[PDB]
Amino acid sequence: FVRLTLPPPKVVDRWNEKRALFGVYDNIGILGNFEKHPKELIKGPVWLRGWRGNELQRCVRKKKFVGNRMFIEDLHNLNKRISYLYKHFNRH
Amino acid sequence: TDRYWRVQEVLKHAQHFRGRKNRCYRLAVRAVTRAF
């Protein structure tokens, strides 16, 4: 069934600092004499900063990067998940 | 989220049917096509 009440009114500012300053320095490499590569500006998980791969590759790279810092429970779960993923992609 | 309107489309053509057919979408849809 459907709502019988109106949702709260929402107004979004498209000129906020985050949106206004979005994309600045995206040309750092070409405009910065190539001292800093644009890949250096990527913020995210360490094992996938400036790198891309399939789900299996991402998990494997994650294991290598933080394997020494991973929990035993997480490490055991990752190994079990990897085994299932390995069989599916490499045999089916 | 608009499945209700889809039912209404069948219902408007099946309102004049008799029995559970006029009120059951599974049956109402079949009758409408046969009638058409």
Partner: protein, 87 residues
């Protein structure tokens, strides 16, 4: 709004702290020290004399030279023997 200052890479030599456990081993190797010298030269402060092989290294280097790298005279002898065998 005014844009933030552009990000800048820190220039100049950077010396890792040897005692710190976190610092990776490869960053504390002499090869790393030699790399620092090349980047900044005198600003690095690496003694130029250290760059050349040490006397113990010098003795080791000569061992491979004799063991693995024959001289021209030795090859000339080998050519003569092989030519005689071929003849």
């Amino acid at each position: 709004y005014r844009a933030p200052p552009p990000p800048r890479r820190r220039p100049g030599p950077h010396s890792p702290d040897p005692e710190n456990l976190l610092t990776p081993r490869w960053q504390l190797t002499p090869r790393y020290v030699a790399k620092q010298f090349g980047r900044h030269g005198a600003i690095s402060g690496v003694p130029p004399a250290s760059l050349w092989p040490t006397p113990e290294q010098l003795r080791e280097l000569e061992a491979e030279e004799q063991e693995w790298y024959p001289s021209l005279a030795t090859m000339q002898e080998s050519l003569r023997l092989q030519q005689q065998a071929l003849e």
